[PDB]
Design a protein around this motif. Structure first.
Motif, mmCIF file in Angstrom:
data_model
loop_
_atom_site.group_PDB
_atom_site.id
_atom_site.type_symbol
_atom_site.label_atom_id
_atom_site.label_comp_id
_atom_site.label_asym_id
_atom_site.label_seq_id
_atom_site.Cartn_x
_atom_site.Cartn_y
_atom_site.Cartn_z
ATOM 1 N N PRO A 2 -79.621 -0.921 -30.253
ATOM 2 C CA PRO A 2 -80.795 -1.229 -29.444
ATOM 3 C C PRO A 2 -81.043 -0.236 -28.314
ATOM 4 O O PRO A 2 -80.133 0.524 -27.936
ATOM 5 C CB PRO A 2 -80.487 -2.581 -28.790
ATOM 6 C CG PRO A 2 -79.011 -2.836 -29.020
ATOM 7 C CD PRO A 2 -78.568 -1.942 -30.160
ATOM 8 N N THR A 3 -82.275 -0.266 -27.767
ATOM 9 C CA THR A 3 -82.620 0.415 -26.519
ATOM 10 C C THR A 3 -82.141 -0.435 -25.337
ATOM 11 O O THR A 3 -82.396 -1.665 -25.309
ATOM 12 C CB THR A 3 -84.138 0.637 -26.373
ATOM 13 O OG1 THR A 3 -84.549 1.509 -27.429
ATOM 14 C CG2 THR A 3 -84.500 1.198 -25.019
ATOM 15 N N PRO A 17 -79.508 -4.546 -23.411
ATOM 16 C CA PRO A 17 -80.577 -4.428 -24.409
ATOM 17 C C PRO A 17 -81.903 -5.089 -24.001
ATOM 18 O O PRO A 17 -81.897 -6.150 -23.350
ATOM 19 C CB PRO A 17 -80.011 -5.130 -25.636
ATOM 20 C CG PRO A 17 -78.482 -4.946 -25.445
ATOM 21 C CD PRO A 17 -78.265 -5.111 -23.975
ATOM 22 N N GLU A 18 -83.030 -4.479 -24.428
ATOM 23 C CA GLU A 18 -84.402 -4.995 -24.132
ATOM 24 C C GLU A 18 -84.619 -6.470 -24.507
ATOM 25 O O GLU A 18 -85.424 -7.177 -23.819
ATOM 26 C CB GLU A 18 -85.445 -4.170 -24.900
ATOM 27 C CG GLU A 18 -85.461 -2.707 -24.532
ATOM 28 C CD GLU A 18 -86.628 -1.997 -25.247
ATOM 29 O OE1 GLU A 18 -86.627 -1.948 -26.490
ATOM 30 O OE2 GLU A 18 -87.544 -1.501 -24.513
ATOM 31 N N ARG A 19 -83.927 -6.982 -25.517
ATOM 32 C CA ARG A 19 -84.054 -8.403 -25.914
ATOM 33 C C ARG A 19 -83.793 -9.336 -24.702
ATOM 34 O O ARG A 19 -84.381 -10.433 -24.693
ATOM 35 C CB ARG A 19 -83.162 -8.731 -27.115
ATOM 36 C CG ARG A 19 -81.680 -8.820 -26.763
ATOM 37 C CD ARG A 19 -80.766 -9.038 -27.961
ATOM 38 N NE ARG A 19 -80.579 -10.420 -28.356
ATOM 39 C CZ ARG A 19 -79.759 -10.814 -29.329
ATOM 40 N NH1 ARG A 19 -79.086 -9.905 -30.020
ATOM 41 N NH2 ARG A 19 -79.616 -12.103 -29.613
HETATM 42 CL CL LIG Z 1 -83.061 -5.190 -27.835
#
Ligand SMILES: [Cl-]
Ligand SMILES: CC(=O)c1cccc(NC(=O)N2CCOCC2)c1
Ligand SMILES: [Cl-]
Ligand SMILES: [Cl-]
Ligand SMILES: [Cl-]
Ligand SMILES: [Cl-]
Ligand SMILES: [Mg+2]
Length: 346
Positions: A2-3, A17-19
């Motif tokens: 992930p980013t 992570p962006e989540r």
């Molecule tokens: Cl993410």
């Protein structure tokens, strides 16, 4: 991969992570934030470990915690939703983040301020024992069961958390403190090699407090607490005295006047007779003679809830690492492998 994004919250860098969105500090072994998980729709706790690899002791504790959380897959036990590091290689690995379901109230928030029926006490203690049957079947000892380590929701559903990771200090166990009131006498005073039976003593102390609304053994220090315990259950007979390995501990016990076990119907006035019977089977001084979690689930007190086809056991758990002598970087490599191999639940 992930980013990830970075932000500073109360003097600490968080890279996640962006989540995970809308992070907000909730407290502080590490620092914790509440967040919303956009992948699952759950509200979660994100824990950033502090100084996870600072010593051999700390590196091994970090590995121990990650192995235990990855193993626990049961409705009445805290599970691991995610684990991550922003590192792209072992060479730059320095931070570990753990993600669980966000817990609201604990048993303290319902035993202090709420009216519990006998049916509430049956359902709450049933769930603790269902979770313990699972934990003990893997040869895991919790070692720190107490009301603040039990999460409860609006529907009276319960989860065990905050396993003893060999943590508590001498200062933390001194004086008029809830950290010692639920501990079995053989571990409070180092009488002998202890085993999983110590957790059943703690369940007895919790069950008594749900019935009366009062702490069972609120000692002002280790010796005051032992005197409260022996006044209820009686002084040890010759058979238990033989099992205490410390000669000084045996001499101290023999200095006290002999006392018989009390009548528990006259202590727990008006309780369900089946509740009184189960308490007499948990609160036994000799740990070899205490009821087990599997035996307690089949007790007539739980007849409304007991289902022997819905009380599962754990997969086998290898703890051979506990006797292993490794360097900081070897413990750190083992931990890195466990982070990258994680598979999320369904
Ligand atoms: Cl993410
Ligand atoms: C349901 C139940 O068992 C219950 C409920 C409330 C209180 C108590 N027992 C005590 O508070 N005791 C009685 C005698 O010993 C000192 C104080 C028992
Ligand atoms: Cl969970
Ligand atoms: Cl890192
Ligand atoms: Cl507590
Ligand atoms: Cl294993
Ligand atoms: Mg806790």
């Amino acid at each position: 991969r992930p980013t990830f994004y970075r932000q500073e919250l109360n003097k600490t860098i968080w890279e996640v992570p962006e989540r995970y969105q809308n992070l907000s500090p909730v407290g502080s072994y590490g620092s914790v934030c509440a967040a919303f998980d956009t992948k699952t729709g759950h509200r979660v706790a994100v824990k950033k470990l502090s100084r996870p690899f600072q010593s051999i002791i700390h590196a091994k504790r970090t590995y121990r915690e990650l192995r235990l959380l990855k193993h626990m897959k049961h409705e009445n036990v805290i599970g691991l939703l995610d684990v991550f590091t922003p590192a792209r290689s072992l060479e730059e690995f320095n931070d570990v983040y753990l993600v669980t379901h966000l817990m609201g109230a604990d048993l303290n928030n319902i035993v202090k301020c709420q009216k519990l029926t006998d049916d509430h006490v049956q359902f709450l203690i049933y769930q603790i024992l269902r979770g313990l049957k699972y934990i003990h079947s893997a040869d895991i000892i919790h070692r720190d069961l107490k009301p603040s380590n039990l999460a409860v929701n609006e529907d009276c559903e319960l989860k065990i958390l905050d396993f003893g990771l060999a943590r508590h200090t001498d200062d933390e166990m001194t004086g008029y403190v809830a950290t010692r009131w639920y501990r079995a006498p053989e571990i409070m005073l180092n009488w002998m090699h202890y085993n999983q039976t110590v957790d059943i003593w703690s369940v007895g102390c919790i069950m008594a407090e749900l019935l009366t609304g009062r702490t069972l053994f609120p000692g002002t220090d280790h010796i005051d607490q032992l005197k409260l315990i022996l006044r209820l259950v009686g002084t040890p007979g010759a058979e238990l005295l033989k099992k205490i390995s410390s000669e000084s501990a045996r001499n101290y016990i023999q200095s006290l006047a002999q006392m018989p076990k009390m009548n528990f119907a006259n202590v727990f006035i008006g309780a369900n007779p089946l509740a009184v019977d189960l308490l007499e089977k948990m609160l036994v001084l000799d740990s070899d003679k205490r009821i087990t979690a599997a035996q307690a689930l089949a007790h007539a007190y739980f007849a409304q809830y007991h289902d022997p086809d819905d009380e599962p056991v754990a997969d086998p758990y290898d703890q051979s690492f506990e006797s292993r002598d490794l360097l900081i970087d070897e413990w750190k490599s083992l931990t890195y492998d466990e982070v990258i191999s994680f598979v999320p639940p369904p």
